[PDB]
């Protein structure tokens, strides 16, 4: 076995940011350096470990996380950032150990005429704690008046669709983001790298 790192990165389907897909990598060797040097990746920012030295570390568990967000909001996934996309959808832990990787994906995911499939939350009752997915469609009672399950005044449907048209501005272009979180400890470790 060789780690299915490549398969996830180029996978046919990536879910919306409101409801992300988490897959556990297990008992395998992954060549992080190949991904590192490749120019395919627009951002390969790594937290908790420098990418260069990541070559020989042995890691007890690594998690694959998938979501699609626009270019403007790539900065908003990092430990501690405050924003609508970060706060109400995916929040990295303050001590997150891993790398956030994004690449421009207008060629594949985006379609002429606009791809409206992807959806992101906006109005939510309370801020989510680290790594907390919310799939609820319960109308948000923002206003004082009771919502009573029906949309309208003071009843906001949380989901809204990104306007992903190929011609749109550089900032609004689609990007594909994979979050890999690493844990280091003294125990049998699933991913031990090349050695």
């Amino acid at each position: 076995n060789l780690c299915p790192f490549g398969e996830v990165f180029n996978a046919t389907r990536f879910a919306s940011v409101y409801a992300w897909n988490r897959k556990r990598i297990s008992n395998c060797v992954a060549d992080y350096s190949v991904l590192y040097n490749s120019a395919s990746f627009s951002t390969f920012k790594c937290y908790g470990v420098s990418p260069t030295k990541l070559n020989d570390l042995c890691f007890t568990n690594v998690y694959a996380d998938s979501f699609v967000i626009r270019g403007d909001e790539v900065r908003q996934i990092a430990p501690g950032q405050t924003g609508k996309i970060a706060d109400y959808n995916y929040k990295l832990p303050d001590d997150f150990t891993g790398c956030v990787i994004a690449w421009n994906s207008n060629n594949l995911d985006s379609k002429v005429g606009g791809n409206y499939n992807y959806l992101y939350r906006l109005f939510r009752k309370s801020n989510l704690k680290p790594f907390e997915r919310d799939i609820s469609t319960e109308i948000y009672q923002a206003g004082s008046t009771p919502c009573n399950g029906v949309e309208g005044f003071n009843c906001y449907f949380p989901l809204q669709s990104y306007g992903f048209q190929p011609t749109n501005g550089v900032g609004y272009q689609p990007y594909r983001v994979v979050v890999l979180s690493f844990e280091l400890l003294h125990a049998p470790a699933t991913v031990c790298g090349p050695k």
Partner: nanobody
Amino acid sequence: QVQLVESGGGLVQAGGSLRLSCAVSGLGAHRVGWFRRAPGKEREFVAAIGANGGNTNYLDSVKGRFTISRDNAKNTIYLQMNSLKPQDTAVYYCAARDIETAEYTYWGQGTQVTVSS
């Protein structure tokens, strides 16, 4: 800006289905909603669908007989009113949302559909 024109409004007999198809300009990212004015009642939500989505919230009153479809090609939203009970007569209006604040920003003028017992 986006402006909508509603068509398909007319009288029908009891139990009839009148297909309400609304032409939309500029559609694709905006969500679209259907609302009605009862004779002496203020509007209450009927249906709305997000673009390229199956996310549908309906009133209990209209639950299980009204469904919506999105072409995404002819920029129209269609509402199939099935087996309308007589006292449902109302004026239905298409509406669109941006970053929702007080309410949906854009209101089309709508059309008149009345059932006859």
